[PDB]
Amino acid sequence: FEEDAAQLKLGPEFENEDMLTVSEAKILIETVLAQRARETNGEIPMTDVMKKTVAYFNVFARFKTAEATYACERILGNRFHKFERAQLGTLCCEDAEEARTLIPSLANKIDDQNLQGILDELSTL
Amino acid sequence: SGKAVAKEDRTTTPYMTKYERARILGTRALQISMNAPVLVDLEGETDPLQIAMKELAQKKIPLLVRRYLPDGSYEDWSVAELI
Amino acid sequence: AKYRVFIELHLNEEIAAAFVLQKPILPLIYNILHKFCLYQRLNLLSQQTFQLSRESWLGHLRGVYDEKPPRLRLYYWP
Amino acid sequence: TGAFDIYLDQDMLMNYSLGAGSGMGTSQLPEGAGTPYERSPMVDSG
Amino acid sequence: FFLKELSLTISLHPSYFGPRMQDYLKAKLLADVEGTCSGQYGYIICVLDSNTIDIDKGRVVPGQGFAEFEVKYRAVLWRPFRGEVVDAIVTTVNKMGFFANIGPLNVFVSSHLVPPDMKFDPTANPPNYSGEDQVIEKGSNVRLKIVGTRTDATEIFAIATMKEDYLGVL
């Protein structure tokens, strides 16, 4: 029935939900682990799913810091499209023309000038 | 279509019904029979039910009763509440 | 040294925290005074209980200082 | 006798008549009840 | 990646009623859902236990002696969808395509979906797909655009291409 790509299309519930960020996601994961360790015997198998994530997460640390994430958040703001948001903060770089290509759903969603300004702030961050 | 009812504004009878006693004792029986946390000083019994009855007498037994109304709403009662 | 460090520190620190708010103020300090030293009494007495339990004379008698808020169990002979 | 259902008064088992914070009697891991300087939520909300 | 609310039922056993059930229910939940995957929600990375953990119910079973505890929880899940662009980590390189890897999901980049500038070199020290200076070996995260996804047995699998602009070596 629904197996498109869009263009912002697909499951309704998932669409409604907000796509978690990469760096922020990893931070939250870390936080979660810390809360669990609070009274552990030692070990706690991380299965196979954990390993992979642990690697990908670290290999994509777009904000190796607890404040980096907050800075990023501050920089952002306007929702627009959860997906698009998390996507823009997961890719990075750099020009407008490139933004549309990656996210065609941006068509007449946002201008340019602004975009450029955001990229510069990220590169410096 | 449930609705749930206020633990403060309960309608039904404060006393425990002929049938309920029979169902509760039936229920804890199975529970204890299934090695379960017994909630009163073991008098020295053997019968997973004759024990449950020791509990009932002292109203020291878990389990609650959801009394569905015709509406579709319900009420929850505590064994210690009932009579 | 270290006692006068870490103790007096947070003492005076949260005394200043007491200045931050509407006044109790001194009586709380007066409480914490007897509090700490009498806790220290609790484990002097506990160490006494191990003066008896860890060594002479005999065992079974005890006064272990539980991790709970403070307690000393003077369990005897069976 | 089948015209009602049953659940559990967890409340009783919880507060149930009486009735601490350590972690160094062997378990290499530590603890301290739960106040060594750490939060939670907040970050999540952000 | 998403942070969503999911449900799950825990069917507890009399033996574990004790006075700290709450803990048991939580421990059982983490074990049953974490690491699992579904086509509907995808990979259930982990559950945001604490604060975001509701424990409703429950109603004991008539002929079983077990009670069912419904549980609402917040979790981090990883569900992919056709058309999404993601960074992946190349694992293997065979004259059959590119066996990348994103997080916990496995993405396969059919050779037919790779530009004609990346010839396959099996003689080169470590089998790779260079062009074209750009060299993609078993250590170079590439950018792909999911073309199609599938869900066979809770597990998910889709194919990505490198045909569009701004895709490929990273």
From Swiss-Prot, chain A:
It is found in: Nucleus. The keyword NAD does not apply. Pfam families: RNA_pol_Rpb4. Keywords: DNA-directed RNA polymerase, Nucleus, Transcription. One of its GO terms (molecular function) is translation initiation factor binding. InterPro entries: HRDC-like_sf (IPR010997), RNA_pol_Rpb4/RPC9_core (IPR006590), Rpb4-like (IPR045222), Rpb4/RPC9 (IPR005574), Rpb4/RPC9_sf (IPR038324). PANTHER family: DNA-DIRECTED RNA POLYMERASE II. This is DNA-directed RNA polymerase II subunit rpb4.
UniProtKB/Swiss-Prot annotation, chain B:
The gene is rpb6. The lineage of its organism: Eukaryota, Fungi, Dikarya, Ascomycota, Taphrinomycotina. One of its GO terms (molecular function) is DNA binding. GO terms for cellular component: cytosol; nucleus; RNA polymerase I complex; RNA polymerase II, core complex; RNA polymerase II, holoenzyme; RNA polymerase III complex. Belongs to the archaeal Rpo6/eukaryotic RPB6 RNA polymerase subunit family. Phosphorylated. The keyword Coiled coil does not apply. Component of the RNA polymerase I (Pol I), RNA polymerase II (Pol II) and RNA polymerase III (Pol III) complexes consisting of at least 14, 12 and 17 subunits, respectively. One of its GO terms (biological process) is transcription by RNA polymerase I. The chain holds residues 60 to 142 of 142 of the full protein. It comes from the Eukaryota. This is DNA-directed RNA polymerases I, II, and III subunit RPABC2. DNA-dependent RNA polymerases catalyze the transcription of DNA into RNA using the four ribonucleoside triphosphates as substrates. Common component of RNA polymerases I, II and III which synthesize ribosomal RNA precursors, mRNA precursors and many functional non-coding RNAs, and small RNAs, such as 5S rRNA and tRNAs, respectively. Pol II is the central component of the basal RNA polymerase II transcription machinery. Pols are composed of mobile elements that move relative to each other. Its main location: nucleus. Keywords: DNA-directed RNA polymerase, Nucleus, Phosphoprotein, Transcription. It is found in: Nucleus.
From Swiss-Prot, chain C:
Coiled coil: none annotated. It comes from the Eukaryota. It is found in: Nucleus. Component of the Mediator complex. Component of the Mediator complex, a coactivator involved in the regulated transcription of nearly all RNA polymerase II-dependent genes. Mediator functions as a bridge to convey information from gene-specific regulatory proteins to the basal RNA polymerase II transcription machinery. Mediator is recruited to promoters by direct interactions with regulatory proteins and serves as a scaffold for the assembly of a functional preinitiation complex with RNA polymerase II and the general transcription factors. Belongs to the Mediator complex subunit 14 family. This is Mediator of RNA polymerase II transcription subunit 14. It comes from Schizosaccharomyces pombe (strain 972 / ATCC 24843) (Fission yeast). The lineage of its organism: Eukaryota, Fungi, Dikarya, Ascomycota, Taphrinomycotina.
UniProtKB/Swiss-Prot annotation, chain D:
The modification Phosphoserine is found at residue 40. It comes from the Eukaryota. The tandem 7 residues repeats in the C-terminal domain (CTD) can be highly phosphorylated. The phosphorylation activates Pol II. Phosphorylation occurs mainly at residues 'Ser-2' and 'Ser-5' of the heptapeptide repeat. The phosphorylation state is believed to result from the balanced action of site-specific CTD kinases and phosphatase, and a 'CTD code' that specifies the position of Pol II within the transcription cycle has been proposed. The C-terminal domain (CTD) serves as a platform for assembly of factors that regulate transcription initiation, elongation, termination and mRNA processing. Belongs to the RNA polymerase beta' chain family. DNA-dependent RNA polymerase catalyzes the transcription of DNA into RNA using the four ribonucleoside triphosphates as substrates. Largest and catalytic component of RNA polymerase II which synthesizes mRNA precursors and many functional non-coding RNAs. Forms the polymerase active center together with the second largest subunit. Pol II is the central component of the basal RNA polymerase II transcription machinery. It is composed of mobile elements that move relative to each other. This is DNA-directed RNA polymerase II subunit rpb1. The chain holds residues 1444 to 1495 of 1752 of the full protein.
